[PDB]
Amino acid sequence: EFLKRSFAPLTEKQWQEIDNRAREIFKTQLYGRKFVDVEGPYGWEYAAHPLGEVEVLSDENEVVKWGLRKSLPLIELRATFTLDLWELDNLERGKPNVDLSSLEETVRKVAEFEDEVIFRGCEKSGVKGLLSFEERKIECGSTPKDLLEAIVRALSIFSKDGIEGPYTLVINTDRWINFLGGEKRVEECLRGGKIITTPRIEDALVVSERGGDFKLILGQDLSIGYEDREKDAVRLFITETFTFQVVNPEALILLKF
Amino acid sequence: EFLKRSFAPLTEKQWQEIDNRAREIFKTQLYGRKFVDVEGPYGWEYAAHPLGEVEVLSDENEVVKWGLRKSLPLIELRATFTLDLWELDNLERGKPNVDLSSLEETVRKVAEFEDEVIFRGCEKSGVKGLLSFEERKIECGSTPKDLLEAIVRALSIFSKDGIEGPYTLVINTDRWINFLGGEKRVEECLRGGKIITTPRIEDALVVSERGGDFKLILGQDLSIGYEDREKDAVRLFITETFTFQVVNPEALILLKF
Amino acid sequence: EFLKRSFAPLTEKQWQEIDNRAREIFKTQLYGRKFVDVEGPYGWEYAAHPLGEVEVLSDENEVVKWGLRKSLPLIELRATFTLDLWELDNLERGKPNVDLSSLEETVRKVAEFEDEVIFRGCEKSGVKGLLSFEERKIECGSTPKDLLEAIVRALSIFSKDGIEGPYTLVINTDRWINFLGGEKRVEECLRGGKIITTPRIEDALVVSERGGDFKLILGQDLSIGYEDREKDAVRLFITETFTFQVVNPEALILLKF
Ligand SMILES: Cc1cc2nc3c(=O)[nH]c(=O)nc-3n(C[C@H](O)[C@H](O)[C@H](O)COP(=O)(O)O)c2cc1C
Ligand SMILES: Cc1cc2nc3c(=O)[nH]c(=O)nc-3n(C[C@H](O)[C@H](O)[C@H](O)COP(=O)(O)O)c2cc1C
């Protein structure tokens, strides 16, 4: 496998120490993955996703008219870190808590990078994030009473387009501290929805989780591999290939506060 | 099917009149397809072919380094023409030779367009044609005696790279008129090769047809569909999606004459 | 079928793109259909619904007395729109979000027309809407406390006529914003009823959903058919034949606010 893992000087039981640690922090820090849906991994060779359109390049008077097919190129990221090799060997002498502080700090730089692509998009990549669809904004206020009014007025914009599913509220974590009062009034105006507090946006946004409006395309899910061995340390990396696209911008609404 | 053929006012026996005519002219006029090999059609939705490389876009001091995956976008061409509808109806009264002169003139504009992409490449498409690999040139002359010497010196450049298969000579059609003398001396210096005279290049070139050095990627092979009906005529089109890439430039040699 | 759908230049997979879109907006925008009941479609030839009465036209001294039987004529509506044909063809190249903005704007003109017939009735059609039965009005106020009192006084008018079923509250959407406070006090004074906020009336009204008091007669449910093909566009239409009649006006009460 392209992740040369059977070449690293680590025991088969030391590898699972590293895997569990990274798999626990990814589950809680990948916020985009809590309301978008993932098209299963297509493999390490997948390179572009079809947009389904032609881009004409010929003249208006030509006999043979032609153009190129547009697609979306996949982003590939690689983040490397180092582990002290003596400390990892203490795990064989029966030590339950080894020092992976270099693994966890790097797992959080990657999770935070993958969320600027979903929320803010990437200029060079050709990705539009959720926060740029700014013709879907609506006012709000400061009191728990007014958050309720912004959600009943948002569900009328959904039902006016035929978007009707389970609804979700993605809200900043410091704004939520003020609305802790009506946390069961809110979660039932959404009709048994779900509140996802996140330190990745300032304001809030409501989305319809009926399925198929925000796709995360995965070529290769997050993996850990082996790079090189320095004197008394190994150098590993985290890799992934993905892209993101909003299909229906009608299933999204931005609250302004 | 995307070719709305069951909506054209043509009999199932008038459609095969049109298909046979276009299939006979494509067999003789698509010269590139006589020594390159075709990766079977991937479908009407295929949009890009992987080049197998990453293009880095991050800084040198960043923690999470990333880049985009390079691919080759597929060209889609459409050429339309018109058929008089009364003349096509004479085919039902038992007429063997109807007038498809509008079909054949358009089938030759398409075949000739598809060969500038293989021999000269396309700047905007991102395709390199055979005639640009100009570090593989070698001299020649004017007499049949010297054409033989240029082929024995070309087969020594092949065997020096380990390229050893059946060999082919693609030569201009007006140059060949001079070498008609030794047409069996030539075709056995190539070791039972094959001569393909073509009005698509000035000089000649020798290629190794062992397999896998010049790939034509087909999304949708050449097809005929229906567009619209004017007053007393139908309007059809010829469509195709393809791309071309040289894998090993060592299996090619350009003679200069 | 009278909807000449097998004559439109659309793929069997492009037709379902159009059907799902119109079926999703009708489900949320046809508000009358949420508390009235529908007598199944009688077909495309049904033309009139019997009122069950005779209208005498003879003299008082005649030997043979005669009259005509009264019925209710069915309304037939047709709304046409246009779709760009190139954009629909992008759906075959694998595009999930094509532009049907001309379909959805027309589906909302039709849904809103069908609701003026239920709420305001039609003079020429011979239909009485719910809002004209104005001998069933009762006062209300402005505070959540008073909305509760208007519902306990309304359920005593129902039980005085023997109308006893599940109860429903159909209220303007901008009035509801004020009563968001007691949304579980309200929905249990109705004895586990149901609140249907709608932008189709100013005030509110309470109805008994026991069955058989408000009938919507359907000849042909909402359908999409094919009309003609312009140069680079198709022209489709939405059709339907229906009529509406209140059977028992005792199962209805109008709140005045
Ligand atoms: C008792 C003992 C146990 C050790 N266990 C490990 C170990 O499990 N993994 C490891 O990478 N180095 C371990 N080391 C360190 C190496 O054996 C080696 O002594 C050190 O990396 C460099 O030694 P130097 O000062 O001679 O260059 C251990 C050293 C000692 C004295
Ligand atoms: C590469 C290419 C692809 C095309 N594909 C379509 C198509 O799928 N459907 C269509 O109606 N017209 C298509 N056209 C337009 C044709 O020229 C058509 O005969 C005419 O332009 C229709 O009018 P329009 O350009 O406004 O669509 C295409 C043109 C080109 C150059």
Swiss-Prot record, chains A, B, C:
Record entry for activity regulation: Proteolysis activated by calcium and cobalt.
Gene Ontology biological process terms, A to Z: intracellular iron ion homeostasis; iron ion transport; proteolysis
InterPro entries named in the record: ENCAP, Encapsulin_nc
GO MF term set: peptidase activity
Biotechnology section: Foreign proteins can be targeted to ectopic nanocompartments in E.coli upon coexpression with a construct using the 15 C-terminal residues of Flp (AC Q9WZP3), tested with GFP. There are at most 20 GFP per compartment. Empty nanocompartments can be disassembled by extreme pH or by 7 M guanidine hydrochloride (GuHCl); only reassembly from GuHCl-dissociated compartments allows incorporation of targeted cargo.
Residues bound to FMN: 78-80, 86, 89-93, 227
Source superkingdom: Bacteria
Subunit structure: Homomultimeric. This encapsulin nanocompartment is formed by 60 subunits; monomers form 12 pentamers which assemble to form shells. There are 12 pores where the pentamers meet as well as 3-fold axis channels and dimer channels; none are larger than 3-4 Angstroms in diameter. The N-terminus of the protein is inside the shell, the C-terminus is outside. Probably 3, 4 or 5 Flp cargo decamers bind inside the encapulin nanocompartment.
Note, other: Shows substantial structural similarity to gp5 of the HK97 viral capsid; while the sequence homology is weak, it suggests this protein may have evolved from a viral capsid protein.
Domain description: Has 3 domains; a discontinuous peripheral domain (P, 13-39, 76-133, 221-254), an elongated loop (E, 53-73) and the discontinuous axial domain (A, 137-216 and 259-263). The E-loop forms contacts between two subunits, while the A domain mediates contacts in the 5-fold interface. Pores are formed by residues 184-189, pore size can be modified by mutagenesis.
Name this protein carries in UniProt: Type 1 encapsulin shell protein
Species per Swiss-Prot/TrEMBL record: Thermotoga maritima (strain ATCC 43589 / DSM 3109 / JCM 10099 / NBRC 100826 / MSB8)
Gene: enc
